[PDB]
Subunit: 237 residues, 4 copies
Amino acid sequence: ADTIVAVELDTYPNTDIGDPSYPHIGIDIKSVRSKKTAKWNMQNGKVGTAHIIYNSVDKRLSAVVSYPNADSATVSYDVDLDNVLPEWVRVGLSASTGLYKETNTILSWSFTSKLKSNSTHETNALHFMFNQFSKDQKDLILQGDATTGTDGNLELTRVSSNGSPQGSSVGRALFYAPVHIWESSAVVASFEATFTFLIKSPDSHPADGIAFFISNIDSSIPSGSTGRLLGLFPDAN
Amino acid sequence: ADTIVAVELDTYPNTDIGDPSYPHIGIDIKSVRSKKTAKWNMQNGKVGTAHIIYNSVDKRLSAVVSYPNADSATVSYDVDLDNVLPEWVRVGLSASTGLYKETNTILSWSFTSKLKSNSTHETNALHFMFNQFSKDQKDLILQGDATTGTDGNLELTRVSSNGSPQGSSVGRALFYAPVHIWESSAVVASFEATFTFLIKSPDSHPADGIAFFISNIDSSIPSGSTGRLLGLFPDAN
Amino acid sequence: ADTIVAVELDTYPNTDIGDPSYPHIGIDIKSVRSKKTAKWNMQNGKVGTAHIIYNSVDKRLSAVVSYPNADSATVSYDVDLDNVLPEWVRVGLSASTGLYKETNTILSWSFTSKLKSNSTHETNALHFMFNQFSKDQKDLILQGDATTGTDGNLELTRVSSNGSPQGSSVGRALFYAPVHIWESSAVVASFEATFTFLIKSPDSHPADGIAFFISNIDSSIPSGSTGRLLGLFPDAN
Amino acid sequence: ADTIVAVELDTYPNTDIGDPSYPHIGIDIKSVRSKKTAKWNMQNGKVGTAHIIYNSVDKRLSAVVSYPNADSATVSYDVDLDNVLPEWVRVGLSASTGLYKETNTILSWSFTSKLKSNSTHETNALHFMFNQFSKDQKDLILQGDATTGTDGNLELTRVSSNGSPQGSSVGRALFYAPVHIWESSAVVASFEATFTFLIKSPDSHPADGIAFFISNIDSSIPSGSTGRLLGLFPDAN
Ligand SMILES: [Ca+2]
Ligand SMILES: [Ca+2]
Ligand SMILES: [Ca+2]
Ligand SMILES: [Ca+2]
Ligand SMILES: [Mn+2]
Ligand SMILES: [Mn+2]
Ligand SMILES: [Mn+2]
Ligand SMILES: [Mn+2]
């Protein structure tokens, strides 16, 4: 049903569904089994930053994840998103926990989309930036366990009062307005997304991860997508 | 019911509801009877540009309207919008015709809103720019007779096949996402809107005008607001 | 010689040249004796943020200074900068120490200038943002004791190896490119500047302050402007 | 001496130095003999738009050129600019005429550069946009025959009073401030340039072309680079 293109920051190695044996960042085109992955030296309790970029001329989705004072992890995949997504999509962040858990806190999120047409100066653009989230963020569609305002952050999965992450949680937050990613007279379409996150677990094996995703506008959390499916896919195919 | 703050480009002098005897630009705070107006040397058939700016430190809503090769018209009004509007609003463009008519074509529209909080670097922003409108613009809520895609323009009021404007028409287009204009820890909130329009009438007395407005998110066209009420107000009080 | 318009964050009350008896923020139009001031509850050792805005329609220069978890200080002054500055100016940050001292560290600085002409879509813009400063920042003109790269920050006045601020220091940093602030067919000109700073003194009476300023392009530090003159004015008239 | 990376809009086929037999767009890395070209259906007397993009993660320089109501031409080349250019560069536009000629008019030019560091939220950016050029554009370095203000346009090569293009002309315009394109803790560096141009010749064989280029900051026009060398290269090697 949903068409999902996602960049996952997967904290738990589910080697049985194709994950590598370490935290990794991957590019998922309609399947949790990433088309490409790169080792990610995930840092528990540290604030990281993910940058995702794409443009219709190169047709390459690339992502860079970094932590202050550390070397970055980057992954890229050649894919023509016009062939995968609808021309109107919603963008969001998703995260889950399963038997293992972690906080999936988002501290800021910005996104810029641009469609440059062939008429001179005909640029259509959408840009949003959230460096703080209020309890009543009317421009975000929160699905599942996702909540805003707790310390001005967006908590994608359930965290109990004493800051503790809860297992079997799944939450997503999508920007309210549809995003136009293809248009017939557009000569170049591009987007850039950036978000900082804080993944913290009391456990030595945090799970499951955070994913920036683009989907059909009506996307909703698939039943049973807690844990390894990142609140994005119905199954592991 | 609706709370409306609007900058009107009024093409027809309804001297009986307080308009001056000439085309004028005015600032309307909850009433069609503008709190302030300025003479506008409206140019039939020429593309104009309106710029509207406001920031919560100065609490002054200002608008400048110009035509290429001509002198601008500007109007400003001191008003604290925190005291008039809700903290979440929708922004839009509205226009109408009555017994007299004109095309109320919008060729481009950009808007930028910013809320700078007191935490270091905590900026929340929303920016959209439309330099072309497609027939299925999913990020715009079109109300009344407003349509998009005709020559990539947004036609706020009805235009028949042979380019002719129709009387008694009213249409509005609002950006889909709510806009956050006040937040408790914001030290400065500001917005800037710009739109180019083309008002053309076969008649010597075009009517009724175009208005950039900000309203409660659920605003809808008031019954009977064609003509002098600009699709914004229920009556002329 | 130099034409200076500056927003000062004055940490030391020189009541003899008109300062009030407390830290204050003020708007200086060609004189160190501010045209308007507001009490500033300056916080030693804390990172603050200053926002400065202005547009040619309202002709009001306004500034807001804040510290996380604290109430802001704001000051505004009605002034038509077209009547004070040249149409091409350089923008910068200046700071000084005298007998009393403090570190005048700048951690980030962004500036946006826009000139919207009367031709449809004719916007001229300049935007720079520095969230990190490198030792060889070729796009900044550093004058006096100002240095960059120390912890990626810009140190406007001299700081010795052990982090200690030195007295009788004065330094300014200007963006390399001239900024066009007036143009004959411009219907609205506006600018916005933001910078975060960290003023820290071992002493109970820090001095002298930091100032965001706009000047003729060839401005240089006036002789003897350490201390109370903020590296901006030749004398206290 | 100069390090030049340029995207050329070559109007004249100098098949002897490797041009194809038609107008073409090409990517030049330190040589006029393009590393990659694409046929360009150049339209004499029509305003076109060129878009150039690049980011350090993909290391692909791509350009798209279009005319209203026509299909675009696009060319891309895989190149790591960190390995070719200095970390501080100047960006510009260059053009020339030789025995054959054409007007090389620039109507608008925007450029955005971004360097995202590994510290959370550490973005350094530079953005300029010129939609009009004044006779005294102090933020542009004009070299050779380039002049500004004629109809608010930038004329890269000599045009006589009666609008006629002159042969053997060469002119370049560079943005005044150095641009920082690489920095040691940057996880992603990217730029985007856009410019609209109007190439008009009374002749059936216009020459020579327009080029968007990036170079060492001190670049100057090489002697003898009129005609086929586009005011960029000293020779045709
Ligand atoms: Ca996994
Ligand atoms: Ca009226
Ligand atoms: Ca003082
Ligand atoms: Ca050639
Ligand atoms: Mn995985
Ligand atoms: Mn009126
Ligand atoms: Mn003072
Ligand atoms: Mn060539």
